[PDB]
Design a protein around this ligand. Sequence first.
Ligand SMILES: CC(C)(NC(=O)c1ccc2c(C3CCCCC3)c3n(c2c1)CCOc1ccccc1-3)C(=O)O
Length: 517
Amino acid sequence: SMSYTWTGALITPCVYATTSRSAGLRQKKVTFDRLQVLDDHYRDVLKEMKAKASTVKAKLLSVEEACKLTPPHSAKSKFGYGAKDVRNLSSKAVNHIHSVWKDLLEDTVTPIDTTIMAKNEVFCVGRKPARLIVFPDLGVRVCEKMALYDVVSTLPQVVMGSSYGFQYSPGQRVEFLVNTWKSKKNPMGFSYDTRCFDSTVTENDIRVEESIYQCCDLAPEARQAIKSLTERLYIGGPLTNSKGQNCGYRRCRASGVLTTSCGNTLTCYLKASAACRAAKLQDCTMLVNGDDLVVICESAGTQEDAASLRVFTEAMTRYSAPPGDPPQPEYDLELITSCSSNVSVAHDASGKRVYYLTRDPTTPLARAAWETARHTPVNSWLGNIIMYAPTLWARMILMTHFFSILLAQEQLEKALDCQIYGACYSIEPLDLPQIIERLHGLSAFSLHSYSPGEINRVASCLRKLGVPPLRVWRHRARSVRARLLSQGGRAATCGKYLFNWAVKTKLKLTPIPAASQ
Ligand SMILES: CC(C)(NC(=O)c1ccc2c(C3CCCCC3)c3n(c2c1)CCOc1ccccc1-3)C(=O)O
């Protein structure tokens, strides 16, 4: 069936940014008839998964638990309250959510409304159209957590095991990839890019996902709500623009429901697993985060692997998940990008090899540049500093430049909102040494001798963007550093740890103590 049907009603508004002006380009991209044919490989895998699901027990969250787990900056309800009101258990929001939950149990058919908007996201320049998000009202969102919050995390882990990527901290991901890679005699890996994965998700895919939830041991009321949410919301429904006008109907995954991530993870794992069997990949290990898929297996030979991947892709396509980028076999782990990252090697103080996650700095640099400029309530630069703390480009460029700006504006102690790892943290910049040491270990203040590919990518990327060479940054760093040290206190600690790389004569970096008093 068609992933979308449109009524012509415009999708109205809520280095460049995406806007509603390109919504037409995306709609054309995401709108197509899906054809899905399933075979015994798919059925065999689904049965194995259901058997694992059958061992999971999961519980209803009360209205209050679900409110407390509601993120602070969610789009407000059209029923007179917003995310802060939910977090604060205001009577207004509490009363409405109870009415919404009751209606979910008593009505299991009436399509639930959703809003569609185009995202505003910053990119560097072939310009990409804005992403479309589809989401139900805040009240419904909280009820989703009541029914399914205890499901959507626990369940995929049990079903998929080490393949479920969301269980891993950043160092655990690296560890899993490197160990998997080193366990093959002749490793071959490839990422698989599904073309607009959300649009490829069929009604059958979504009823399958529901059938897998129900394999869980649930409360009766939870089964009812999960069935209802599926029928009224998940499988499809009407789309409303920001103006209150209907602009079409959906028959695929909505991007902004609680089950988007769990569901894409299960369905991607299910389809890919079966496709591995169809292709006869040997000693397969998969890693899955939602729609993002990477496979590492035992090489059968250069042309064999190429043929294998083409048969892999044919299976995924039959299963309704056709490739955006045709997949490509790699024989070097560094060259495999999954979840916008790749493993790379450097050396620590004693010259030990340290693997860490890095990525092409283009988008992080562009967004940070954008945030310097227009002073946005969004601080993506700080999140990138944390996520990619060990990297060449985060240490020498982003840290240097932003601690530079923090000093000048004397903002060293103003906490910034930071959305990372699926949560919104209130981050004080002086905490960065302690944060980094926990996430990445001390080696992250001491890494040197980065790979030639990594260095080339960074230096080349800077040139493309008109950013000063790394040499400029090392010089600026030494200045920012001395300023931090001179101020002493927590500022000094930042100079000592975050910038010991810019200095000839290294200070000794010892384990930073937890807070006292
Ligand atoms: C001319 C010179 C040498 N420039 C700088 O010092 C300088 C510092 C930081 C940055 C940055 C960012 C680096 C990462 C943190 C956010 C800003 C970017 N650019 C500069 C140029 C060049 C133009 O604007 C950009 C557009 C896209 C990506 C990066 C940038 C001067 O001294 O005036």
